[PDB]
Ligand binder design. Structure first.
Ligand SMILES: [Mg+2]
Ligand SMILES: [Mg+2]
Ligand SMILES: [Mg+2]
Ligand SMILES: [Mg+2]
Lengths: 108, 108, 110, 110
């Protein structure tokens, strides 16, 4: 049935910078936390800007309490901030710092 | 300066299905109209769901009156609908129809 | 603050991760690590490397080359990816379509 | 309504179009047709075709092969793309970074 296929086609994508994919492990992030950041971005794109660890965990193989701990570690690492909303602003500033570092270290 | 670079890095992307890129000309769309659909998607992603032909045209090489005519042709072609909001729902249903057509015609 | 460098960062681009895959990989029996492994493979395909090795995959992940070969092996066996010489994700898509289809029908969405 | 087919549609993927390019290509002296031409070239690069020809470019556009060669020629001359053997968009990025930089400073955003 075509209306259904058309819906699936139009659902959208989350854009993951190749620079993030290529350097998250150096920023001290794991794959789990990376995915958790993709689920946050995706909640944002549908207007949910402060999703709970259980809304987040629903779509993950981790439990709600485990997800709460992972958000907590991200806040501590300085990878995300709370402003009633999450922001990834600090991820992209850690990321740029680290790329400026590698570049300086690699000559330029 | 790093906060600025980090911002630019985090601005985001509009995801353009390769299937749309590959078949818009067959749906009777031109490059101009294609871009106009990317600017609409982008207004949507920032919460502007009914942008005017002049908001649309600002970011384009076409004038506001020209943009108004292009939106009008899209509504007529059945590529977009108004619901106080635009929707591309009918694009993706024309697109799926056309892909089911080619497939049937190509054997399957 | 070097401009040619910034431009080279900005030109690297993005992997488009479908929301339907993000929304349902757990329901398909994938873990977060497999998901990210699939993203690294996509990223290799988009650089022309159609068959990356487990060492090339592991280099950007927190897992060893050996764990990464185990994970590619387990994805081949779950029928999420196949070798055709190149990896493909088609099998993943077929499983996701069959799932989406079953969810649609059970919600009377057909 | 064939499931293997739907899956093959869904597996085709997406071109990620940066919002900074969309937001400023007119200000760089590009037209909509050049923008879409750049998207078709990106799409070829992501299939491993690092140097598509103007005929391969024109096949999915409303313009002739000859207009498309004219447009690739005009992009080479505006210094939006370069040949290095392969096309690159680096020059475009350098112009966009230099623009973004100038806009930032004029809005006192530095
Ligand atoms: Mg690094
Ligand atoms: Mg066609
Ligand atoms: Mg599901
Ligand atoms: Mg500008």
């Amino acid at each position: 049935e075509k209306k259904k296929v058309a819906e699936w086609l139009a659902q959208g994508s989350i854009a993951v910078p190749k620079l993030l994919l290529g350097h998250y492990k150096q920023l001290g992030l794991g794959e789990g936390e990376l995915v958790l950041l993709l689920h946050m971005q995706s909640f944002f794109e549908e207007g949910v800007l402060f999703p709970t660890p259980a809304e987040l965990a629903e779509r993950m193989t981790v439990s709600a309490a485990e997800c709460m701990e992972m958000v907590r570690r991200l806040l501590q690492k300085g990878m995300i901030a709370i402003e009633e909303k999450y922001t990834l602003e600090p991820l992209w500033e850690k990321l740029v710092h680290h790329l400026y570092t590698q570049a300086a270290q690699q000559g330029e």
